[PDB]
Design a protein around this nucleic acid. Structure first.
Ligand SMILES: [Mg+2]
Ligand SMILES: [Mg+2]
Ligand SMILES: [Mg+2]
Ligand SMILES: [Mg+2]
Ligand SMILES: [Mg+2]
Ligand SMILES: [Mg+2]
Ligand SMILES: [Mg+2]
Ligand SMILES: [Mg+2]
Ligand SMILES: [Mg+2]
Ligand SMILES: [Mg+2]
Ligand SMILES: [Mg+2]
Ligand SMILES: [Mg+2]
Ligand SMILES: [Mg+2]
Ligand SMILES: [Mg+2]
Ligand SMILES: [Mg+2]
Ligand SMILES: [Mg+2]
Ligand SMILES: [Mg+2]
Ligand SMILES: [Mg+2]
Ligand SMILES: [Mg+2]
Lengths: 129, 88, 218
RNA sequence: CGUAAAGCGCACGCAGGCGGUUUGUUAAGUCAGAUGUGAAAUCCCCGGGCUCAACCUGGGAACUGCAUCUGAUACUGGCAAGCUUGAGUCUCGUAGAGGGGGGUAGAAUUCCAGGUGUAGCGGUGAAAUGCGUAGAGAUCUGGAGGAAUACCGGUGGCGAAGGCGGCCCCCUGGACGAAGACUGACGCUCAGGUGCGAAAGCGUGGGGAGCAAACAGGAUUAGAUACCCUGGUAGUCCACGCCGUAAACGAUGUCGACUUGGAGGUUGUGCCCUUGAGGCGUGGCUUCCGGAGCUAACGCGUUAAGUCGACCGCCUGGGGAGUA
């Protein structure tokens, strides 16, 4: 159910994107945001927005480049059934180097590139490319 | 299915005021009330399996509620089961 | 900005979902297109049309329906452009090298209608070979001389031209088409919203295409 | 795991697994560095020694592990207090073959009685068994009895599945809708467990019109332990209690989120000179068709067999065997 909301986010992108849908919204959370952040900073989403207060409302702008969408694939990795935790030497690099891996760490939701530099590791939320 | 008169009664017997309809105790109480009433319905008949399903439903619900209470306010729990007269 | 006296929109339920971005309709259980979006598409329509027409325009005004056909055998036909105004013999772009000989027959026949052999053979063979001609005549006029490969294609009703567009899509032939609310776009590189089968939207944009291929480099 | 092996017939629900949202705290999981340890040989890397090699050997590297200390706090778990969208509770109503109990109605069949009537009726492909002069069938009249409820009736409606159709009262389950109010994550799923669960069949009494396993008789047929005909017992009906299986099928487990359309059916409800028998919306349920997509194909397609998550059942060649 609502039990895993991050996969729900991942999928609302995945879906709307394949639906050539301009925006897409969803109930917000601290967590959710910190990710969209990374998605934006790495140029997969266009721009996010949290239009709420009591009942927060994370909202994202999808991009489309050529004819495609910018997100060729968005999978969950960790999940409440089975949590994944890679050290640092073990951090997974997506599409060789292209595309990213969203990982939470003792210091915030970063990208595998970033986390690798940081010198740390953590829960590898999802993969994007 | 329980009298608006009677259901109201109990709301005003277990909650803050009437309107405090969803107060735990109040649910647990007007469930109890029906569950008990019903025991005579199914005293005759007994072959009314279908209706029985709602009654089981009733019990398992009130049970979950009763559980949750004990988890929160163990005081309001004991008070309630004494005063509703169950849990032996 | 509009010019279309009356092509407004057209076509009722049968709308194809993908034709949303070019519709603002609602009148009486039929949608009017986006009057003001058809237009910035004449920008690009006749533009990259005339753009290739100067660099040398070889068009192919593909359009059919016994109620609009002959109204393409005109300045559409006449000027720098060629036309098909009947049943689109499937594979005529895609089998151009099979059909090429369906031309040699047409000529080698009319080139011998008032020429060569004719009033001889039987008084049977006569219009009993112009039944051959009248046939191959329609469906295979605008083929006649081809000279400079089919290069873009102007097509009347996108889906009613299922085949010819698809053919082009295959062959690298930019397909300029006007696509009703009901017709399926995206087969069309240069998409022209609005009505497709009212005697106007045709002649209008139709004759207005002739009127830009016809002249581009003097 | 729709049709190839594979979703328990269905439901509730303990353990367990999973769990919306904010803040604080915790620091077990997780992450970091340090330190110790992880025997030698082996394996691998670069050399060296036997005429080469196999073989021998120096040195690194590796031993992906464990443990202790110290730190990091995003995620997970613990603790605390919240929050309102998830989930419940309350008010009014709507549709309904939802369940249980008691009444009751007309149409028919069979039977009993009688009137009239008289030589056949019945049945098949053709016949015969059968029935009729103790008068059949036919026809009219009255009566008894059980069983099922024409027309409405409809890809109509309800239920968890099984399944539930005359009318009425009584008891009762669920669903949905319009508002607003209260509870405040109280939830999802569920091995074990419990309940329900067509028809057949079993136990005791009862009931028995029609149908009909068995059985008898007549036929057909090379044969006919059948299909057809004349009869007809159990059973089919009620009460109590068993049994627990069906192609128990959508051959598709439940819950939740997301993703173009079109024409109906059904059922609530808001708004418009109600001024059209309506007009524009907005929920629940459903049928056909169809896009992406998915698929071996067939096909599925917002009621997914699409895109995702939580949990559970189950599959691992055919036969043997759902057998011992
Ligand atoms: Mg199978
Ligand atoms: Mg959370
Ligand atoms: Mg060693
Ligand atoms: Mg050597
Ligand atoms: Mg926490
Ligand atoms: Mg009678
Ligand atoms: Mg009678
Ligand atoms: Mg009710
Ligand atoms: Mg049972
Ligand atoms: Mg039975
Ligand atoms: Mg019996
Ligand atoms: Mg018989
Ligand atoms: Mg079975
Ligand atoms: Mg079925
Ligand atoms: Mg099933
Ligand atoms: Mg639809
Ligand atoms: Mg379909
Ligand atoms: Mg699915
Ligand atoms: Mg057995």
């Amino acid at each position: 159910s609502m039990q895993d909301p991050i996969a729900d986010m991942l999928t609302r992108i995945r879906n709307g994107q394949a639906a050539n849908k301009a925006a897409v919204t969803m109930p917000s959370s601290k967590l959710k945001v910190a990710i969209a952040n990374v998605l934006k900073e790495e140029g997969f989403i266009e721009d996010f927005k949290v239009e709420g207060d009591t009942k927060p409302e994370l909202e994202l702008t999808l991009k489309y480049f050529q004819g495609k969408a910018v997100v060729e694939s968005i999978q969950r990795v960790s999940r409440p059934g089975l949590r994944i935790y890679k050290r640092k030497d073990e951090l997974p690099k997506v599409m060789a180097g292209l595309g990213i891996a969203v990982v939470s760490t003792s210091k915030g939701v970063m990208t595998d590139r970033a986390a690798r530099q940081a010198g740390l590791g953590g829960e590898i939320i999802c993969y994007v490319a | 299915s329980l009298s608006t008169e009677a259901t109201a009664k109990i709301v005003s017997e277990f909650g803050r005021d009437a309107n405090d309809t969803g107060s735990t105790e109040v649910q647990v109480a007007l469930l109890t009330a029906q569950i008990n009433h019903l025991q005579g319905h199914f005293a005759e008949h007994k072959k009314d399996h279908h209706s029985r399903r709602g009654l089981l439903r009733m019990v398992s619900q009130r049970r979950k509620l009763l559980d949750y209470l004990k988890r929160k306010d163990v005081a309001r729990y004991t008070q309630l089961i004494e005063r509703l007269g169950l849990r032996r | 900005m509009l010019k279309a006296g009356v092509h407004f929109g057209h076509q009722t339920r049968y709308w194809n979902p993908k034709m949303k971005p070019f519709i603002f309709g609602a009148r009486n259980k039929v949608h009017i297109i986006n009057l003001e979006k058809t237009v910035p598409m004449f920008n690009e329509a006749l533009a990259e049309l005339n753009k290739i027409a100067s660099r040398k325009g070889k068009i192919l005004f593909v359009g059919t329906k016994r109620a609009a056909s002959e109204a393409v055998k005109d300045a559409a036909l006449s000027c720098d452009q060629f036309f098909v105004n009947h049943r689109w013999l499937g594979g005529m772009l895609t089998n151009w090298k099979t059909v090429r000989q369906s031309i040699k027959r047409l000529k080698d026949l009319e080139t011998q209608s008032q020429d060569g052999t004719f009033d001889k053979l039987t008084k049977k063979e006569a219009l009993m070979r112009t039944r051959e001609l009248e046939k191959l005549e329609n469906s295979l006029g605008g083929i006649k001389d081809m000279g400079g490969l089919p290069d873009a294609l102007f097509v009347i009703d996108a889906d009613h031209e299922h085949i010819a567009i698809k053919e082009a899509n295959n062959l690298g032939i930019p397909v300029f088409a006007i696509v009703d609310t009901n017709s399926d776009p995206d087969g069309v590189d240069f998409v022209i919203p609005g009505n497709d089968d009212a005697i106007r939207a045709v002649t209008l944009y139709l004759g207005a295409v002739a009127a830009t291929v016809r002249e581009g480099r003097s």
